[PDB]
Amino acid sequence: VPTGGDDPTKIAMLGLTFDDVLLLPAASDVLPANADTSSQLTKKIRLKVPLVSSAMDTVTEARMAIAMARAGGMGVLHRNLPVAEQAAQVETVKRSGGLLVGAAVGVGDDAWERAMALRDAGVDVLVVDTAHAHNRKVLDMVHRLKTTVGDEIEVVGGNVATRAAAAALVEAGADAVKVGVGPGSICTTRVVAGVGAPQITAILEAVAACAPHGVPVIADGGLQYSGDIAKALAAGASTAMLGSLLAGTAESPGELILVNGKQFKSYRGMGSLGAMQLVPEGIEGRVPFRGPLSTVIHQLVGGLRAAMGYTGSATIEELQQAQFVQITAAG
Amino acid sequence: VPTGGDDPTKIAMLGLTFDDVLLLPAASDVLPANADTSSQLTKKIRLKVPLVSSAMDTVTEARMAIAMARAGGMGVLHRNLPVAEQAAQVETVKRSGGLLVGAAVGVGDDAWERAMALRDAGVDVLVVDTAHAHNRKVLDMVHRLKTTVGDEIEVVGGNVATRAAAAALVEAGADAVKVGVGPGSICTTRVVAGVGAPQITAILEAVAACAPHGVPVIADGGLQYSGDIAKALAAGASTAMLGSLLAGTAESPGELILVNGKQFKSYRGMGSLGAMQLVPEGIEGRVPFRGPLSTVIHQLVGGLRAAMGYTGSATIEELQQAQFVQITAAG
Amino acid sequence: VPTGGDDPTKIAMLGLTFDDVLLLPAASDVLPANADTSSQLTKKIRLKVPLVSSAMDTVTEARMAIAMARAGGMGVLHRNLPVAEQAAQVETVKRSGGLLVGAAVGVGDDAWERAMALRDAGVDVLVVDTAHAHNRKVLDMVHRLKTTVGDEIEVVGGNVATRAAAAALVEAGADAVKVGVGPGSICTTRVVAGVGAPQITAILEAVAACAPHGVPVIADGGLQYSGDIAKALAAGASTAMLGSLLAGTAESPGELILVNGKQFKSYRGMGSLGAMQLVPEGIEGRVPFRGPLSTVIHQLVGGLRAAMGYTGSATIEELQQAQFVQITAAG
Amino acid sequence: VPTGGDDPTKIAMLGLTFDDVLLLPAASDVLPANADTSSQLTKKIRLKVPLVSSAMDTVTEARMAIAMARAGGMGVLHRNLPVAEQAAQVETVKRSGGLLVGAAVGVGDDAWERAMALRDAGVDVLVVDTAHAHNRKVLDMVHRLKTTVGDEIEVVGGNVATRAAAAALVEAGADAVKVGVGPGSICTTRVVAGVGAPQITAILEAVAACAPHGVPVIADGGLQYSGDIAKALAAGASTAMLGSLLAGTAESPGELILVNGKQFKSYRGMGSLGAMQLVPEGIEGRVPFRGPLSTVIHQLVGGLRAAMGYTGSATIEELQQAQFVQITAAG
Ligand SMILES: O=C(Cc1ccc(F)cc1)N1CCN(S(=O)(=O)c2cccc3cnccc23)CC1
Ligand SMILES: O=C(Cc1ccc(F)cc1)N1CCN(S(=O)(=O)c2cccc3cnccc23)CC1
Ligand SMILES: O=C(Cc1ccc(F)cc1)N1CCN(S(=O)(=O)c2cccc3cnccc23)CC1
Ligand SMILES: O=C(Cc1ccc(F)cc1)N1CCN(S(=O)(=O)c2cccc3cnccc23)CC1
Ligand SMILES: O=c1[nH]cnc2c1ncn2[C@@H]1O[C@H](COP(=O)(O)O)[C@@H](O)[C@H]1O
Ligand SMILES: O=c1[nH]cnc2c1ncn2[C@@H]1O[C@H](COP(=O)(O)O)[C@@H](O)[C@H]1O
Ligand SMILES: O=c1[nH]cnc2c1ncn2[C@@H]1O[C@H](COP(=O)(O)O)[C@@H](O)[C@H]1O
Ligand SMILES: O=c1[nH]cnc2c1ncn2[C@@H]1O[C@H](COP(=O)(O)O)[C@@H](O)[C@H]1O
DSSP states (O other): OTTSSSOTTSEEEEEOOGGGEEEOOOOOOOOGGGOOOOEESSSSOEESSSEEEOSOTTTOSHHHHHHHHHTTSEEEEOOSSOHHHHHHHHHHHHTTSSOOOEEEEOSSTTHHHHHHHHHHHTOSEEEEEOSOOOSHHHHHHHHHHHHHHTTTSEEEEEEEOSHHHHHHHHHHTOSEEEEOSSOOTTBOHHHHTOBOOOHHHHHHHHHHHHGGGTOOEEEESOOOSHHHHHHHHHTTOSEEEESHHHHTBTTSSSOEEEETTEEEEEEEOTTSHHHHOOOOSBOEEEEEOOBOHHHHHHHHHHHHHHHHHHHTOSSHHHHTTOOEEEEOSOO | OTTSSSOTTSEEEEEOOGGGEEEOOOOOOOOGGGOOOOEESSSSOEESSSEEEOSOTTTOSHHHHHHHHHTTSEEEEOOSSOHHHHHHHHHHHHTTSSOOOEEEEOSSTTHHHHHHHHHHHTOSEEEEEOSOOOSHHHHHHHHHHHHHHTTTSEEEEEEEOSHHHHHHHHHHTOSEEEEOSSOOTTBOHHHHTOBOOOHHHHHHHHHHHHGGGTOOEEEESOOOSHHHHHHHHHTTOSEEEESHHHHTBTTSSSOEEEETTEEEEEEEOTTSHHHHOOOOSBOEEEEEOOBOHHHHHHHHHHHHHHHHHHHTOSSHHHHTTOOEEEEOSOO | OTTSSSOTTSEEEEEOOGGGEEEOOOOOOOOGGGOOOOEESSSSOEESSSEEEOSOTTTOSHHHHHHHHHTTSEEEEOOSSOHHHHHHHHHHHHTTSSOOOEEEEOSSTTHHHHHHHHHHHTOSEEEEEOSOOOSHHHHHHHHHHHHHHTTTSEEEEEEEOSHHHHHHHHHHTOSEEEEOSSOOTTBOHHHHTOBOOOHHHHHHHHHHHHGGGTOOEEEESOOOSHHHHHHHHHTTOSEEEESHHHHTBTTSSSOEEEETTEEEEEEEOTTSHHHHOOOOSBOEEEEEOOBOHHHHHHHHHHHHHHHHHHHTOSSHHHHTTOOEEEEOSOO | OTTSSSOTTSEEEEEOOGGGEEEOOOOOOOOGGGOOOOEESSSSOEESSSEEEOSOTTTOSHHHHHHHHHTTSEEEEOOSSOHHHHHHHHHHHHTTSSOOOEEEEOSSTTHHHHHHHHHHHTOSEEEEEOSOOOSHHHHHHHHHHHHHHTTTSEEEEEEEOSHHHHHHHHHHTOSEEEEOSSOOTTBOHHHHTOBOOOHHHHHHHHHHHHGGGTOOEEEESOOOSHHHHHHHHHTTOSEEEESHHHHTBTTSSSOEEEETTEEEEEEEOTTSHHHHOOOOSBOEEEEEOOBOHHHHHHHHHHHHHHHHHHHTOSSHHHHTTOOEEEEOSOO
């Protein structure tokens, strides 16, 4: 074995991230303005725009959820607050029309009660929200939710970064599988634990387990540009979950901050000290202020549409079949 | 598959750019001063210097076209202006002697009328000027131009980045194929759409489709140094189209700009907000002022001549057979 | 041979360092708080935490050794001081309870006498401390120590970076093998001699020789983050030896230094001019002040525990079987 | 072909430079102080230290040549001056004892007369000094010199970067082959012409042609650290030629320069505008002042000795058999 030892499986794969690849143009009859951007969030739920906002307390509360749903995507309400308050935010969203909304739950002692209160509040999607879903406790929560409230509510499980973990969530009954262990912009899991999986490879692997069962994959974390959204979908994901790209918007929680004459908003990991209040796996940072959500989404979907034009993809289903070229450091 | 999934074709190639390769020296009887730098722009047109200026409104109007032709290359007049004005610029060039000149046309509703007005004005080369030529509308424009005015005018089609797209333009009747999707210095297609193809690989692939039909390939975009010109031709291109390298010259449109005691000129993508006036695929930037075009071309051709010396290439046709070494990040 | 010449063995391997790999998550029933972090330092000695402090005069004297042992690891006392003083530091550590302690010896003329004085002082571990242990003089010292005092004292040999060198130390009778030629943060061997071996590959190779003989491998040098500790153990090492990561602590020798309003401590290679007082193979630098050792170790072990959680490793022995993904420059 | 096209030979090799590799430690009985650093400069001339100074007018005139020879290496006098003056510098060196000295000649009209005047002056080594020796004019000069004065004078030919070019110089009668097209610190051939060959691969290839004929290879250009000297010799070179590493010394031509409170000396390519006084293939730069040559050489040889210690190489001939590990960008 060229990299050392006598075990070829010790280093199991070469992991690619978004920056490692570009989409290849292909024969096209598709105009960007006419591409169909709709896609499955879950087995049963189709969104008009394949984007969801991260379940983070500097990204998604009721205001962001309402704006995301109106833009044709969805928000996932964070769970770093009391149950009654999270459920009240679900009600606030439903009050603003027939708007789709999701909400995160953990697998702790109070997670079941949280889930039931969200259900009562009329939530459409429950996201079992962990750093590592390949675990009996997480798989049991997914299964029990699906068997109990699964007729009225779609259940998302995550996060995973391997084929076997995605397969386990599929077996548990997940309606969608969320992919991303370590790629987040505010993530320090890669330096603190030395654990992760570059996101293009993680998506390709999870899709290999999920697509043959008709389970959509949500690409979560590491998306820096609108082009990354196109790459993630081309890798086989059905939607993308955004934190950093949406934390700078007016609709996100938190105040404008002014440093050196420029405007910013705070953006922090749910595993940062500030969020948990210990061995943190996230930092507390800042992102440039970007203005209204509607305008950010327009530009993000605009980029996706351009990609669909270049690749001849009339639908997201066709984009999931596009090809990549791998690029070097120079590129 | 080591990079993920079960499909070996998902990541179809490893794409190299100019910085990924160097030309290998070979046995040489060629002195730089005596190398023959002439090359086919199209099937019928041979230039004394294998260089053309980009169809951009911060690079080529009549002044640049005249200077390029006198230097032994050619200018392609941009189309970001009314038809009558573009045609008037063609006439201005023809007024300055028997000078070759090209002009860009789109595939929009007014493109045909633009093309006919350019023809009337005495243009030598029409460039069907798009970001993605692998499209029925573009191929039809190429074909119809070639069948209508193809006896008196050479028709260039572009841009492409794959073998199949180059093949389609050849079948459509292109007299030359222009290569470059995403590599331009002012291009943001790679970050906005996540689409592109590193330029050495794009040239190698397009040449594989074009050379066996005797159709010359124009390498368009991403050339940063005179050495890149030699690499592009060695990859099989017959000419190179330059934007950034010529936007700093006296002959380009626009004014000198002074910032921090240094001189610059504005250089902007035709897909930038400022050019289109939306989801832009180019930026508005600046390049150092470089002085007279004649002098820039001298240095660029000087570098090419040196390369022909090192590789023993007496002609561009011989340079197209030179070999590369791939280098690493360290190199 | 693609990289040149006709000898495939000239470039014998592709060497990976910590930054080249990530740990892959796997099926897990392990909570970080419940993972067992104990591991063999030597054939006979098991530590509660798999960490030892470097034998450097800006890292480990009696104070650091006491604190390391109390934290469940061990200190190795440097040998850049007279024999009587090093032995007095061993006695100082033993005075503070039944605390494990190690001490470095060279292979010079006075090394044997140093070793015997340390033995008299009650040292638990002798570390034959060289830059290159694949040498008859070093192997003889290891063997003679093991045959003379080997019943009461464990003998560590190092450093090595190849399978054959590790094999030689095993044959000589080493109770543990220390791995690292060139990777230290303060090391200039790679630029001065052009010699080294990236540390993940060096560990994989040394482990291939040491594990089948039940000899533990100590990963020494190049660890920058707590995540690197997890990677090193996953590569097959049984413990990690830390210099830079512990030189910033209160317990390390030396004074606080203030530059530009920030606090630092001096950290220098034992091959630096200042340490030797010539062709130095280390620099004299500074590291940020990090506070109490206890707190640094808590965070380092915290990261390791997280990794054990992600990988489903209940023990270090299980972590040594985890898998990697190789990442690119982009990742 | 993964990188494009249908020709596997288009991209003929993967070129490695010094930074791409490290020397692997091996079994050693060699102490650095006792290693034998002598090596063949040419078939007949053995130096005590395997180092020669570049034929550049900011590196080697009589003072540097005298100092190099006294240090056990050799200087090659530049040829950017009238014949009588170069010959007078040869005489000045011979006046300072039985000191070896070389001198550069071109292949121009006056090169033969230059060569004869150097011969009369008592030069030991003539270096046919070009950027590309794979050329009939250069090979003829080498041959004619060798047949005319070859009994009393050793003839070096260069530069080359390929096996075939090295083979041609061997056939022409070269007593040594100098390797390096494009790697020099002050070189812009790689950006101006797009031509070059990373130096480890160039050495491996040239050695494959030269060693079986007993012709020593001189590694010329790109050496930045003393460790690079060890790498070059391990790749199979018999000596290294240094420009930048010696241009900062007291013995080099030119004055001390003070900028921002630090001392520098000018260092310029022989293909720079200033040297030629056009399309330059070198820049005019500055290097830190390093003090006396004797001290620089001590440190450089010190590093080489350390490498010989780590690799168990008692002689340079043994070092030429050492092995490498290839490293990544991270390493
Ligand atoms: O409970 C723990 C500790 C733990 C848990 C299990 C395990 F297997 C190992 C360690 N954490 C730490 C990680 N987070 S997080 O906030 O940083 C996080 C949240 C959403 C997605 C993420 C994806 N990748 C990385 C982190 C992610 C959640 C809480
Ligand atoms: O019409 C569109 C949108 C579009 C069109 C089709 C398609 F398949 C996807 C998206 N554009 C956007 C791209 N440009 S451009 O000005 O930026 C451009 C111009 C010359 C060459 C280029 C090469 N690569 C990249 C851009 C290039 C042209 C207009
Ligand atoms: O005696 C020598 C010279 C020498 C010795 C043998 C040999 F094979 C070649 C050269 N040295 C120089 C290297 N050191 S060190 O202080 O820099 C050092 C100390 C702990 C571990 C290290 C790992 N890698 C690198 C250096 C290391 C020890 C003394
Ligand atoms: O005559 C020419 C032009 C030329 C000559 C032939 C050829 F095949 C192509 C171009 N030159 C330009 C290159 N130099 S140099 O001073 O820059 C130079 C000098 C020593 C070694 C070098 C190694 N690599 C690169 C440059 C080198 C010499 C003069
Ligand atoms: O503290 C943290 N550490 C690691 N990952 C986090 C943390 N907080 C949130 N995440 C994940 O990072 C995603 C957002 O990543 P981003 O869009 O690149 O900023 C979120 O959807 C989570 O999956
Ligand atoms: O706005 C843009 N986005 C992407 N490519 C552009 C744009 N405008 C011009 N181009 C292309 O970039 C080429 C010039 O690239 P450059 O020489 O690297 O600056 C032009 O010839 C076009 O093919
Ligand atoms: O001067 C030196 N040169 C090279 N390696 C050294 C030197 N001094 C100590 N070391 C080694 O570097 C290790 C610490 O590396 P670090 O933890 O990355 O700082 C030590 O345990 C030694 O093995
Ligand atoms: O102007 C130049 N352009 C390219 N190579 C040069 C030039 N001048 C000298 N050289 C070569 O560069 C070598 C020195 O390289 P350095 O030691 O890396 O600075 C010299 O021995 C020459 O072979």
